[PDB]
Amino acid sequence: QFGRDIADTTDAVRDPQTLEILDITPCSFGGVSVITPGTNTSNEVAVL
Amino acid sequence: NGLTVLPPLLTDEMIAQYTSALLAGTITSGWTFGAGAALQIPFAMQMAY
Ligand SMILES: *[C@@H]1O[C@H](CO)[C@@H](O)[C@H](O)[C@H]1NC(C)=O
Numbered sequence: 573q574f575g576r577d578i579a580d581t582t583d584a585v586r587d588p589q590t591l592e593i594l595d596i597t598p599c600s601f602g603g604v605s606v607i608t609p610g611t612n613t614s615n616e617v618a619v620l
Numbered sequence: 621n622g623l624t625v626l627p628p629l630l631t632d633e634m635i636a637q638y639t640s641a642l643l644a645g646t647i648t649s650g651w652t653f654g655a656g657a658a659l660q661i662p663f664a665m666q667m668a669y
Pocket residue numbers: 612613
């Protein structure tokens with residue numbers, strides 16, 4: 573009915589209605605990093 | 621799952637450019653490229669040093 577990764581994270585499921593098979597991928601997340609020169613030089617920034 | 625893997629700053633195809641520069645210095649210029657100047661020297665004379 574459902575599938576596990578090497579570390580026992582669940583990573584696939586059957587739809588119980590149409591018995592086709594779905595992968596589960598986490599919703600994307602990550603660090604917002606601000607690239608800045610020194611404030612003395614400029615107030616402009618770029619965001620990674 | 622909260623866990624992340626960040627990339628290295630020097631990519632593997634760019635570490636391999638430094639190892640190439642280090643041995644291409646070593647093969648053409650002995651140790652001298654450590655002491656600032658890459659002085660060429662023919663290799664059978666480097667091995668005599
Ligand atoms: C940087 O900011 C400090 C504090 O205002 C100031 O003393 C210094 O002169 C500044 N230097 C430059 C290059 O802007």
